[PDB]
């Protein structure tokens, strides 16, 4: 059968996984102790695509936790769901990161890549036939960038036939806290584009605005931000774990989403977000779902595709639907903005329908977007990188590490090439 093993890395990857894994435990309905309480057969049947079985009806997750700083793991292990996580899978180092790409990519990874690959391969023959791998980390995360580039470079040669899914978050455009972050991103994305087959693009500022817009709860927890996104990649995996007249294969999705090789970066889209009174003020209907689904304010990933045009679109629908409404809504949006798409491809929409609603709500959906709105993203970092490299600030650290400016030359060169590639295809 076809299964999936997860990779969690970076200190954000530490928090997101716990939130990501607790959702899955709850949505399949296992107690915190780990003894599954049989209530839905379908979640009972298709658990083996992500989880293995331990003794006593205990569902051992198939994921690998890697970090350097113990305290984050201690907080995670002390969470309500660390017990389902294996001390075997807790791999880490004896060093502090310094939040540095160079040490995390060359120095400290040297003595940990061996251990981490051993853990993942042990899981690899433990399972039979994977679809691939999915990775939760940050591009602006120092340790996550460091280890991820190492392992994603490796697992290509051993497994060039699988899905190397990458889940990374873009730091805030207005401020990145870390000042060497533009350097870390430029390095990491350069290897990322060579190694990844898929990349999710998410930025925190939108979630702040989403908290302002529909949440309306002033002061949230960062875990709630994790909670908001934890539903996202869960929804795309609901395709695999749940039945319905929809082809769930990410390959069948990716080939529908990848017209040309360099298109790796994609924008999520989620379904009803509702405020205090509007839960009972909302007539939950496919059109108003469809209306809300395609809202520039409903966007959360990077920025408004209003600045550019639409290359390809894929919305997966979760709940009790029919082929009639999804078809007309597709016609509705098609005629709504026919010119906003690219004349290169007509019928750039691919739809999937999941007949199994989530727990709590009936009508739901998810969307992945590939529009011409990523230029602003890496163009923004272009002025930053060209700025910082004009007098090589903070460069003495990496030179002692062995780094030198020549590597940065092609690092910026390719992203310049990507700008034109994104520019030329649409413009």
């Amino acid at each position: 059968m076809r299964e999936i093993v997860h990779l969690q890395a970076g200190q954000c990857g530490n928090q997101i996984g716990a939130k990501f894994w607790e959702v899955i435990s709850d949505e399949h309905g296992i107690d915190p102790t780990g003894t599954y309480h049989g209530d839905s057969d379908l979640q009972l049947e298709r658990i083996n695509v992500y989880y293995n079985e331990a003794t006593g009806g205990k569902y051992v997750p198939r994921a690998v936790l890697v970090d350097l700083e113990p305290g984050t793991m201690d907080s995670v292990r002390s969470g309500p769901f660390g017990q389902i996580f294996r001390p075997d899978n807790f791999v880490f180092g004896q060093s502090g990161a310094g939040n540095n790409w160079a040490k995390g990519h060359y120095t400290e990874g040297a003595e940990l890549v061996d251990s981490v690959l051993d853990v993942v391969r042990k899981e690899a023959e433990s399972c039979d036939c994977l679809q691939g791998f999915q990775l939760t980390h940050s591009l602006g995360g120092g340790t996550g960038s460091g280890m991820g580039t190492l392992l994603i470079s490796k697992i290509r040669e051993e497994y060039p036939d699988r899905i190397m899914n990458t889940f990374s978050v873009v730091p805030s455009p207005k401020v990145s806290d870390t000042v060497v972050e533009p350097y870390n991103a430029t390095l990491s994305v350069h290897q990322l584009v060579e190694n990844t087959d898929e990349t999710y693009c998410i930025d925190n500022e939108a979630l702040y605005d989403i908290c302002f817009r529909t949440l309306k709860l002033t002061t949230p927890t960062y875990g709630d931000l994790n909670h908001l996104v934890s539903a996202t990649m869960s929804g795309v995996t609901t395709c695999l774990r749940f039945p319905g007249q929809l082809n769930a294969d990410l390959r069948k999705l990716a080939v529908n989403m990848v017209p040309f090789p360099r298109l790796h970066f994609f924008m999520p889209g989620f379904a009803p977000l509702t405020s205090r009174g509007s839960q009972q003020y909302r007539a939950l209907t496919v059109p108003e779902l469809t209306q809300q689904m395609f809202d520039a304010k409903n966007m959360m990933a990077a920025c408004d595709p209003r600045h550019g045009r639409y290359l390809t679109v894929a919305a997966v629908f979760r709940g009790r639907m029919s082929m009639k409404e999804v078809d007309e809504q597709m016609l509705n949006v098609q005629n709504k903005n026919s010119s906003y798409f690219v004349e290169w491809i007509p019928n750039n929409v691919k739809t999937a329908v999941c007949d199994i609603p989530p727990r709590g709500l009936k009508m739901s959906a998810t969307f992945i977007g590939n529009s011409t709105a990523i230029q602003e993203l890496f163009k923004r970092i272009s002025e930053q990188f060209t700025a910082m490299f004009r007098r090589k600030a903070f460069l003495h650290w990496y030179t002692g590490e062995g780094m030198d400016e020549m590597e940065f030359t092609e690092a910026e060169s390719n992203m310049n090439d990507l700008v034109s590639e994104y520019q030329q295809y649409q413009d």
């Binding site: 004896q94 460069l395 002692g400």
Partner: protein, 105 residues
């Protein structure tokens, strides 16, 4: 005084808290032949024919730095201001620091 095999994680400055590297090590030996003659009498006394370490060992401005971008003339002295002190370049725990940097234009 050699480095062990395979289990090369249980013996590191990780537990030593060593801030000056202990000793360079290796795992390789050329296939030695030789009846390994004895070349002394009773006292470590090398027979005059065979050679030894011929009384080689018998018994501050140096600091870690990268040249980075500090005026060439100042940097040039620093190199000399690092070296020319064998009393801190030869033996006795090692006495020997490192260096890095990049030139100017």
């Amino acid at each position: 005084n050699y480095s062990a095999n395979q289990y090369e994680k249980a013996y590191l400055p990780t537990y030593l808290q060593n801030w000056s590297p202990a000793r360079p090590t290796k795992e390789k030996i050329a296939a030695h032949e030789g009846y390994t003659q004895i070349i002394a009498n009773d006292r470590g006394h090398l027979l005059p024919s065979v050679p030894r370490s011929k009384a080689s060992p018998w018994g501050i401005p140096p600091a870690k730095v990268t040249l980075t971008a500090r005026t060439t003339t100042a940097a040039d002295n620093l190199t000399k201001w690092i070296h020319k002190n064998p009393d801190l370049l030869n033996a006795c725990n090692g006495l020997r620091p490192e260096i890095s940097g990049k030139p100017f234009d």
